[PDB]
Design a protein around this ligand. Structure first.
Ligand SMILES: [Cl-]
Ligand SMILES: [Cl-]
Ligand code: NA
Length: 129
């Protein structure tokens, strides 16, 4: 599923990501935008042989199991494939865990480089929320 921008914002809010750990909805939307361009099926292989999955590019290195990342953890306790569904519940629950781990949204490099300190509100502009 490729979400629309306001469509995703509402899905994220519905799943209680808005202001989760103090991050406004616009941050989460910006993060989704630059991580997967809102596409729930996005996968990208990392140089270390791990793979990032889904709307938030959750990394098999720590967070999910894909069965091909030697020596990795599955800290969200899910198949990385669940991170690729139309329904974003699993991506949301697992992102909540990532974003609590100590570093806030800096765990997402696209957020740090492209969202952090920008006009993140604009991502939810015009949305019926
Ligand atoms: Cl593995
Ligand atoms: Cl923080
Ligand atoms: Na893993």
């Amino acid at each position: 599923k490729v979400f629309g921008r306001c469509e995703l914002a509402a899905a994220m809010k519905r799943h209680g990501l808005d202001n989760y750990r103090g991050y406004s909805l616009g941050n989460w939307v910006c993060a989704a935008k630059f991580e997967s361009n809102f596409n729930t099926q996005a996968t990208n292989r990392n140089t270390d042989g791990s793979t990032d999955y889904g709307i938030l590019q959750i990394n098999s290195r720590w967070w999910c199991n894909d069965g091909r990342t030697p020596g990795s953890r599955n800290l969200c306790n899910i198949p990385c494939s669940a991170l690729l569904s139309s329904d974003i519940t699993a991506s949301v629950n697992c992102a909540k865990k990532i974003v609590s781990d100590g570093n806030g949204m800096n765990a997402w490099v696209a957020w740090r480089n492209r969202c952090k300190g920008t006009d993140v509100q604009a991502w939810i502009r015009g949305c019926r929320l």
